[PDB]
Structures are given as structure tokens and as C-alpha cells.
């Protein structure tokens, strides 16, 4: 697989990947808003034909919680066929390094639904995130989110 920074021209393919894999979706405009606002934070995995097969869609907190700059994963997923390879872990490390070097992020945070065993085992155990707390009825269907938060230090 080929992991590399996201470009404008592969945003639609990030969207399509999101649509296939996650209940939480956005219109293309919101992807564009990520690209123009933080042009090097998002990464993408492509297949031999160049189409998007995994991604992380990252940003920096617009309204900084307590004045300290920090990153936010807003979405990450991989087509079912390319799972269990290391794609997500690798997409996550690339994106994190950029938050630090370009924006001076002192930490990053994300949301996972309480039952997503997969995502938890990825952040908590193999990317060393902490469970910050629990956000009641965060997803549209009412499921609770774990707020996860990794401190850079």
C-alpha cells in the first residue's frame, strides 16, 4: 500500500471511503474546509489503481480549549478489504507528527463510540491514547462516545 499526504483531488475518494465505513458522514465542503484550513494534516492510503482505501481527516481545534493548541482527528477508516495491515496506525503517526511540527499541538483528541472495540484497541493500546471521559449520547443514534486524548510529552 501507498501512504502519503492527502491532496485536494483525492478528497472525494476520502468521502467515499467514509461513506462505505462509517455512519457519521459529511458533505464535500467539509472536506474542502479541512484541506484549505490545515493543508498537510490529512493522510491517505491508495490502492495500486490510485483510489482512496484509507484516510485520516485531521484538524487543529479552531476554538482552542484553554488557549493551548491541539489536534483533533475528525475521521479515520479503511475499506474492509485492507484492514488488519497497519494502515490506520501509520496514517495516525504521519498526521500526528504534522500537528506537532506545523501547528505546535500539545495534544490530540478524538471520539469513539463505546462499542467500537476495534477503534478503542487501536487508540488506547497501540497508539497510547488516554480515555479522557465519556460523552453521553454523542452519536445521532444515541450511543455514548469515549473522548480520547493523547498528550505529547
Amino acid at each position: 500500500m501507498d501512504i502519503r499526504p492527502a491532496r485536494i483531488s483525492d478528497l472525494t475518494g476520502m468521502q467515499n471511503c467514509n461513506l462505505h465505513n462509517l455512519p457519521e458522514n459529511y458533505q464535500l465542503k467539509y472536506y474542502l474546509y479541512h484541506a484549505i484550513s490545515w493543508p498537510m494534516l490529512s493522510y491517505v492510503a491508495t490502492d495500486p489503481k490510485g483510489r482512496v482505501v484509507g484516510y485520516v481527516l485531521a484538524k487543529m481545534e479552531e476554538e482552542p480549549k484553554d488557549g493551548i493548541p491541539h489536534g483533533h482527528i475528525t475521521s479515520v477508516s479503511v475499506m474492509r478489504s485492507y484492514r488488519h495491515l497497519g494502515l490506520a496506525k501509520r496514517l495516525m503517526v504521519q498526521s500526528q507528527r504534522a500537528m506537532v511540527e506545523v501547528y505546535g499541538a500539545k495534544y490530540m483528541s478524538l471520539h469513539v463510540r463505546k462499542s467500537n472495540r476495534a477503534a478503542i484497541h487501536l487508540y488506547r493500546d497501540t497508539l497510547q491514547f488516554d480515555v479522557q471521559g465519556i460523552e453521553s449520547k454523542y452519536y445521532a443514534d444515541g450511543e455514548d462516545a469515549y473522548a480520547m486524548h493523547k498528550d505529547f510529552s
Binding site: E24, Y26, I73, L110, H111, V112, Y138
Partner: peptide, 4 residues
């Protein structure tokens, strides 16, 4: 993933 975040929910908007």
C-alpha cells in the same frame, strides 16, 4: 469520528 466526529458527529456533525
Amino acid at each position: 469520528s466526529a458527529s456533525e
